[model samples]
Target: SGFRKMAFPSGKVEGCMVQVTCGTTTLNGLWLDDVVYCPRHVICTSEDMLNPNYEDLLIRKSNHNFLVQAGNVQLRVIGHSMQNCVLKLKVDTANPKTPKYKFVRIQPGQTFSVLACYNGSPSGVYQCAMRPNFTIKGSFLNGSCGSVGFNIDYDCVSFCYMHHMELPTGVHAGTDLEGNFYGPFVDRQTAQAAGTDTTITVNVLAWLYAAVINGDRWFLNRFTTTLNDFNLVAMKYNYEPLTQDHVDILGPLSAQTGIAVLDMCASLKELLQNGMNGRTILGSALLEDEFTPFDVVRQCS
Candidate 1:
């Protein structure tokens, strides 16, 4: 259709007027009061027609590592690869605690990024870039089979006081109530450095799962206590903790919840029916499935 301009009611709560270019050659324009309305159409013949199948060839480019900056941590695709690659970037700061990781699938010509922030301001930052497994057309390549690369970028911010604290210069060593031994360092700087160097080996994912497992333990413990109190008042009988006899006693109750309840009860019965062993079993199974890096990646995906 040829183009024309006409005013139409803006279908909004504000009820304003909207101007739209219309074409008369096509099934276009508005009809009001069961009458067809036409506006002046102006056709321009000066512009060249568009070519849909046209594509321009580009010069050959080389492949290289790309780096960029913050706030959704900017990433730009600098070079194109013949094969697709999986890129993983891990960010660690002097804070040592708040580490961030990002995984992205980069095609021959595309960019990806993740939102991240520095934990504590320090002099420099460490970033580990890993692409363990990648595909080269039909062939699979393993980057782990070679040396992985790490890029250290020095950036300045407000001085971090935690990393540079003054401490007493004395050889002191002691054991706490928890039986954890402290160091006999000559100075506070040495102690601080030692502590900083000592990495806390923990699976954060498993920590969350452990909390849920502990909750289950508390629930079972409370149930057992309530059952014991009931026996003291009514039946005047004692239930042995997590024994086959206890399983038999709770058979009907377990049956009400079916196989899951029955299996859990049986396992607890075999393992001493108390919170500790129950938690151990539950935590182990949960951690086995939920604690791994792949599971965490899957969860984010």
Candidate 2:
């Protein structure tokens, strides 16, 4: 009538301590962290070591994207139930302090895609936020809430990491002003104000300069603050010195396109130039003397 495994025999004279009791002894259980479970007292072990079956939830530090593995099995997204849960993917590359990769509300109950990447780029750490418009309730059938970890190599394409989606190819839609590609530009007083002293000259083969830029899009959203800032630099900001960040991103853009950064700000002129001229400028100004007279006025006509 007592418990299953630890139950003793029917009523009988209890034996001494050495022989142990012949009668049955009922044992209760304890609770911890609100999780309830029963325990048994075995002959040789201490109270702490008694329950070999007692397990703890695996604690994982989350990163750009979470890779959940329950016990020995990997967590797979189930159909019809995964709807509306915003899954945050954190990457450690951009910064150890900030998450570089994050995906908002994922498709409901869809089979877990191998990997995915965020579509838009981030301006800064403070500007990053995941927008998930659904509910998320993970079945902790195994034990407790899962562990979390960050994707340390999210942006490292060289490695075998995967993004939520493929990055669009072929530069962005716009003109380039690398080589001889010319455009109407004004190096008047306004340009002088925004222009910095950072100067960088690009060498281009005559043929490349003459070739059409075919438009390459590069997001300088993080750099320039306003479009007017871009205008002053594009139309007239005298080239002072280019920052290393600019060079690193714009290095591939050669002199052939004639596209200038213009200034450190985005402007209406820059956007129009991106679509109209082969040489679109976002930020920073090009040297007015770099091109012929006709190139600068062509856009006006």
Candidate 3:
């Protein structure tokens, strides 16, 4: 019959001597942030404690690919039961302060764009505007709306914590320039840019070697599938999101193959170069280069 939770736009309700009536008697409690934290009044597990379900959307911040969890965020369209009730989710992730326009355009009744995160990257204040105005309603947890457009403001708050996906046997994790097998990237900010070249070199080489050198159809299929996912994501989002996923990679594969990443890299390079010379073995650049595999790999690593 009555509202149970308090809603505050500024968030974090902090007050003193909060009281509520129970049937006939008045009960005393403390207000800390829209909810009473008294163990007896509100017993929340640590998982619930982490989120407290503050809003329909929550952003988990990290170095790359900040995850946006919008399981409960959505829009419902009415008034125009006809075919053309369009809902546009205008997103501003570059900044909350500036006025820029982008769209994650969606039709009403489809799943709302939650977890619109990274195929690889951001942690900044985000502004979302739902348009086609009030005939469409945003199911945002915060209290508010207007006529010209509806804007929802939520703070991008911070947190912590990938292994690569499972690779086929003999095809496993491999090092980047940093010797870390996780991300196929270099810290271009604090580290050297050549590191970027080395990593890209190793990661791509190992994948190509596994699929091409090993002559394994399974691994080749995986490599081609991911290659296509990346391509499709780029192509789809470029044309518009009717295709789903904005550069979302289907899975993670190794920067390695049956051999060391650098080794496979050298081998592939050799194979390419061998093509430069008169030879075959699926044909070959690297014919002029040395043939000792381990040594070449060590040199690169």
Candidate 4:
């Protein structure tokens, strides 16, 4: 329909045209001012599942986390930061318990981002950016979204510091029950003075990997792959991680190293330059071969 003021039992609703299907004979529920209130016995859902014309629906005045996987629902979240704000919902048809959004970790004076696609292709964007300038990018993310084009305001990107960039006193920032982040900081410099080396998690897999190694540099250097180390151990130990298990430990290297390696020629300094340029080089297992004294590095060409 059109934007109209509809009658509510206690409040008023000003929203665009949206229809609902309920299992009740009488007024089973009311979609008021973007808030849905219905009896537990009656199941109220959108009129159309596939084209469930999404509107502005929200979880308001609540201190706990909210889950939205019980039905085919569509809506947007505008956290007023009241009580506590945590939206643990996504558009993914898989296990809704898993996080359907993406996030980025950041420092006080740096910018970070990544490129991701939806439904296994770039058919839709599911990317995020974080900053030293402002707080967040890709603010509205759609995880597990269908092969649509843009955002459905799921969880895409979040901003984080290294454990602490330290917000000013009385400032607030934290993750929702879904583990996405929200904070108040127009600028980063004001967030902290000088703190010790602090850091937040980038990805659970990597951090857990580093911790498993426990500052054993020599142990880490023994491996010739990007975290194949942990995978091997996990396989042997049967330490099943509740989160992600696989990762691209040696990713772009395969592409960059092949032709270049077959060419069989590169200097260490030159290789460093190449690594910096491509942003994809390792310290230990970079080359096809390495050994010593036999003290020897390998030749590319």
Candidate 5:
């Protein structure tokens, strides 16, 4: 066999091109990336092709605890061989930039569970993916090293979007300051913060209402963060003006829950008077606040 080199006889290939010969005739083709022809006539730079496939490990629900309180989702990974397995799990929302990752290592025949949290809430759906990485000889799998995809159904029942395992029924827990049904809370200290009492109340109330209506669990994590930050603002920072980020956080919930957010400067005398019974008063105040629900649907014209 003889090797023949053929240049673009008509003109130089603008992007990337490959040349092939049949007997004595030559053919030319161009492509954005790599291109392969039979008999191993491949045209591309080394950078064009980098990934390889490997036998993917197995992933499954180790238990039904996949959905639970505090915006947590559990997963179990099962290894295939007696090889070092590196697993990567990520939580993503509609916005690609909003993502969180969890990493785990497992041995063959061994299993482990990881709890992941969703940060975005109420606005859209959130998804999580578990991928495994393995090496054979000296080569590694390019993408996900698993044949199975693990999925979990998340159900958020309250405007707070607290419980994923169960619906927001008549109320399992005790009442709040305003005598409203209260369920499991992310943090008691944040809930009972003073000084910035109204600030805390409005944020929590907004989250609770959004969760209940939107049925989005991802927001629970954000709500937890918001509550913590506001707790600091009230107690540590001397009740400083709430940050724009915090305000932005409530904006979406406000739009979704059909309740305009409370004016930060408004009177919280009711909430303050019943501060001793915080949840009861806070719940009642938000339920009957001047901000009433309406059908302000978004028009996609």
Candidate 6:
């Protein structure tokens, strides 16, 4: 080496800003540099398990009786069909500040239900008011969605005078494939009419409890309990009902004794005002414990 000629040369190593490493060229996969990801992960995703879009993805339609369970309202989507998909839901149609209402999403050829725990009081009016006053609480950019509207003209709360004695017409029971052993009486109209009285006679419990009894006036005068002669009939039954069961549960007392017992109990209950307010003078013992002996009468002629 000539000192004047040149300085010693060193090798230069080559590398890239982002280099992929390949251990074996033939049958191996290459490994790239650290993969960077977007920082904020969206709660809603394309393949989201929970509902994301306000309506169905591509297209949707649904029928009546479709139900969804939410807080206090047990809501059902009744007899509705859609040509295009949609996300029909109840928004807090009440006002701008209140919590918005959302039921379910509808997609192309897909059906969904919207339901909530709504007592009859607020349901009808709410549904009716929701109609016409509407906006997109949530939605997608492009999909089939027809004009969405609210309906209070349907099964919203209305007074019903249901008659239990007659079989309601157009009401079918056991319509669902797998549902309650004792189904509700269908046909909203009939059910509405027979509202409370529509006797669902599936259970064999009631008949077992209503037993009739007859007792003597002597027994009535002697008995200390508030229960009338009818109670005596229940007490006289031989078999012991299970722990809670009062076997031979009694009905109203025999017509005569019943009337008297009712009158007595009634007077006793009302004594709070008359006796306490000094309208009448009755000693504590007499007020608390008073029984009059009288001959008994049978059922009316």
Position 84, candidate 5: lDDT:
20
Off by over 4 Å in 5: 1-205, 208-241, 264-273, 276-301
- For model 4, the stretches where C-alpha displacement exceeds 4 angstroms are 1-84, 87-126, 130-248, 251-301
- Deviation in Å, model 5, residue 3 alpha carbon: 72
Q: Candidate 1, residues 210-258: lDDT per residue as tens digits? A: 3333343332322223333333322221221223443353344334333
Per-residue lDDT tens digits of candidate 5, residues 244-287?
55455556655655444443212222233234243432234232
The TM-score between candidate 4 and the true structure equals: 0.21
Quote model 5's TM-score.
0.21
Query: How far in Å is the alpha carbon of 228 misplaced in model 5?
Result: 18
What C-alpha lDDT, on a 0 to 100 scale, does residue 177 get in candidate 3? 13
Q: Which model is ahead, 2 or 5, in terms of lDDT?
A: 5
Better of 4 and 5 by lDDT: 4
lDDT of 1 at 135: 11
C-alpha local distance difference test of each model: 0.21, 0.20, 0.22, 0.24, 0.23, 0.19
TM-score of each: 0.16, 0.19, 0.17, 0.21, 0.21, 0.16
Which window of ten consecutive residues has the lowest lDDT sum in model 2?
Answer: 13-22
Q: Which run of 10 residues does model 5 get worst, by summed lDDT?
A: 129-138
Give the residue spans of candidate 1 off by over 4 A.
1-80, 85-209, 212-301
| For model 1, the run of ten residues with the poorest summed lDDT | 156-165
Index of the highest-lDDT prediction? 4
- Candidate 6 residue spans exceeding 4 A from truth: 1-116, 119-178, 181-184, 195-244, 247-301
Model 6 Cα lDDT, one tens digit per residue, 1-301: 0001111111100000011111110010000121100101011234432443423421233322223222233333333222212112221112212111222222111111111111111111111010011111121111111111121113221111111111233221211111111123331223322222111110101111111122111111222223343333322332111111211221123232343333333333343223435332222222211110110011111
RMSD values, in order shown? 28.5, 27.5, 23.3, 19.3, 24.8, 31.2
Question: Deviation in angstroms for 128 in model 2?
Answer: 16
